[PDB]
């Protein structure tokens, strides 16, 4: 909407206060004009029609329980925009400052979040498996990263290409969590998963097997559930990425860590210059090796570490 840029204040899903960029025209709307062509947050009102209504508030104060998922979807979309722009020189998900749209309060008891081809969508959870999913910065960045993938490599959402698609979203979800630097870790979704159980998460990148996901290609799933295991076989690539950054010895193979920033540079270049819709795990290895070669040179430690990490997870 047309209006003047304002700054509201509210509380997120975990109870933390933050400022939000809003727009005033009769009401205060969740419309941040400070980033690209805007970040827009909508109320789906417990239904499944999308996007719903652009979020309107009478006083620019967002402390009601019903407001909290909107506050966090809006704020964390801003953090994710800032990461891509400041770290990778990428302007929104399409590289041309496309408007970023999110809807919260999707459906009833909805234990998931997704990119629907056009926008982000967040359930509230059922209060047992999840609380409102926009409370997790890694979750928000995971979802916006699906849009980046769809505009770039275009990885088809099934089998190995789909597990790469998922891992790319977990990798950048985690790198955004580290960028914001509030309780960062290599786990996925810990801030919004299972409020009655401490210390768990939906997935682990550092140890995928903790949640039943493979950490080696010989343990890949090849059945048909979950689009051929896209949220399962992602553990193999997540483990490789964790090893590239942090190092370790895995099934006897030692990897020298090169740190998060270089991980992100290597995988961003692979995603945007080398991967294609049909890339498999072996082709990802080749894309990551070439990306590291471009950035650091063929004789670099960075290239050697990429090779070690893929060796450690059984991907040649």
Ligand X SMILES: CC[C@@H](C)CNC(=O)[C@H](CC(C)C)NP(=O)(O)CNC(=O)OCc1ccccc1
**Active centre residues (catalytic):** 143, 231
146 is in an annotated binding site: yes
Q: Which residues of 196-216 are buried (b: 16+ CB within 10 A; e: fewer)?
A: eeeeebbbbbbbbeeeebbbb
128 annotated ligand-binding residue: no
Pairing relationship of beta strands 17-25 and 4-11 according to DSSP bridges:
antiparallel
Q: Which residue is nearest to Ca ion (CB)?
A: 194
User: If contact means CB under 5 to 8 A according to the sort of partner, which of Ca ion, ligand X, Zn ion, none does residue 61 touch?
Assistant: Ca ion
CA–CA separation, 261 vs 145, rounded Å?
A: 17
Distance (Å, whole) CA 27 – CA 98: 24
Q: Which of 32, 72, 143, 311 binds ligand X (CB under 6 A)?
A: 143
Tell me the pairing of strands 100-106 and 120-123.
parallel
Give, to the nearest 10 degrees, the angle between helix 260-269 and helix 68-88. Answer: 80
Question: Closest approach of Cβ 24 to ligand X, in Å?
Answer: 33
> Which one-letter DSSP state was computed for residue 212?
T
Q: Single out the segment in contact with Zn ion by CB under 5 A; choices: 14-22, 29-37, 168-176, 233-241.
A: 168-176
233 marked as part of a ligand binding site: no
293: left (phi over 0), alpha (psi -120 to 50) or beta: alpha
| Residue showing the smallest CB distance to ligand X in the complex | 114
Candidate residues 11, 101, 142, 220; the one interacting with ligand X per rule CB under 6 A: 142
By CB under 5 A, is residue 103 in contact with Zn ion? no
State the nearest-atom distance from the C-beta of 300 to Ca ion, in Å: 29
> Would you count residue 169 as binding Zn ion (CB under 5 A)?
yes
Q: At what angle do helices 137-151 and 159-180 cross, to 10 degrees?
A: 130
Is residue 158 at the binding interface for ligand X, with CB under 6 A as the rule? no
Which 182-201 residues touch Ca ion, going by CB under 5 A? 183, 185, 187, 193-194, 197, 200
Binding site annotation covers 160? no
Closest distance to Zn ion from the beta carbon of 17 (Å): 29
Query: Which C-beta is closer to ligand X: that of 203 or that of 220?
Result: 203
Applying CB under 5 A, which part among 60-68, 82-90, 273-281, 284-292 lies near Ca ion?
60-68
Residue 279 CB coordination number (10 Å) = 22
Which residues neighbour 313 within 8 Å (Cβ) at sequence distance 6 or greater?
Answer: 215, 216, 217, 236, 237, 239, 240, 243, 250
Do residues 229 and 220 lie in contact, with contact meaning Cβ atoms separated by under 8 Å?
yes
Is residue 74 close enough to count as binding ligand X by CB under 6 A? no
Nearer residue to Ca ion within complex by CB, 193 or 268: 193
Can residue 112 be called a binding residue for ligand X (CB under 6 A)? yes
- Assess 279 for contact with Zn ion (CB under 5 A): no
- Count of other CB atoms within 10 angstroms of residue 291: 24
Binding region for Ca ion (CB under 5 A) out of 154-162, 172-180, 252-260, 264-272: 172-180
216 annotated among ligand-binding-site residues: no
Q: Is 266 annotated as a binding residue?
A: no
276 is in an annotated binding site: no
Taking CB atoms within 8 Å and a gap of at least 24, the contacts of 122-130 are: 122/69, 122/73, 124/46, 124/69, 125/192, 127/195, 128/194, 128/195, 128/196, 129/193, 129/194, 130/189, 130/192, 130/193, 130/194
Binding region for Zn ion (CB under 5 A): 169
| Residues binding ligand X (CB under 6 A) | 111-117, 133, 139, 142-143, 146, 157, 188-189, 202, 231
Please enumerate, by residue number, every residue annotated as part of a binding site for Zn(2+).
Answer: 142, 146, 166
Q: By CB under 5 A, name the binding residues for Ca ion.
A: 57, 59, 61, 138, 177, 183, 185, 187, 193-194, 197, 200
């Amino acid at each position: 909407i047309t209006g003047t840029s304002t700054v509201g204040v509210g509380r997120g899903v975990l109870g933390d206060q933050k400022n939000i960029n809003t727009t005033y025209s009769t009401y205060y709307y969740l419309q941040d004009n400070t980033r690209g062509n805007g970040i827009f947050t909508y109320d789906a009102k417990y239904r499944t029609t999308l996007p719903g209504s652009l979020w309107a508030d009478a006083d620019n104060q967002f402390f009601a329980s019903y407001d909290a998922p909107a506050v966090d979807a809006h704020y964390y979309a801003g953090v994710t925009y800032d990461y891509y722009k400041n770290v990778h020189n990428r302007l929104s998900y399409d590289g041309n400052n496309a408007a970023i749209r999110s809807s919260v309060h999707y459906s009833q008891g909805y234990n998931n979040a997704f990119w629907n081809g056009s926008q982000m969508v967040y359930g509230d959870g059922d209060g047992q498996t999840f609380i409102p999913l926009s409370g997790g910065i890694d979750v928000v960045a995971h979802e916006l990263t699906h849009a980046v993938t769809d505009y770039t490599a275009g990885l088809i959402y099934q089998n190995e290409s789909g597990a790469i698609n998922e891992a790319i979203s977990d990798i950048f979800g985690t790198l955004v969590e580290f960028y914001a630097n509030k309780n960062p870790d290599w786990e996925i979704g810990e801030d919004v998963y299972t409020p009655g159980i401490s210390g768990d998460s939906l997935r682990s990148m550092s140890d995928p097997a903790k949640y039943g996901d493979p950490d080696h290609y010989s343990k890949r799933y090849t059945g048909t559930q979950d689009n051929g295991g896209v949220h399962i076989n992602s553990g193999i690539i997540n483990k490789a990425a964790y090893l590239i950054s942090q190092g370790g010895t895995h099934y006897g193979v030692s990897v020298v860590g090169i740190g998060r920033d270089k991980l992100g540079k290597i995988f961003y270049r692979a995603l945007t210059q080398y991967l294609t819709p049909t890339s498999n795990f072996s082709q990802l290895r080749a894309a990551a090796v070439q990306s590291a070669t471009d950035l650091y040179g063929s004789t670099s430690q960075e290239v050697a570490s990429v090779k070690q990490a893929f060796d450690a997870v059984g991907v040649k």
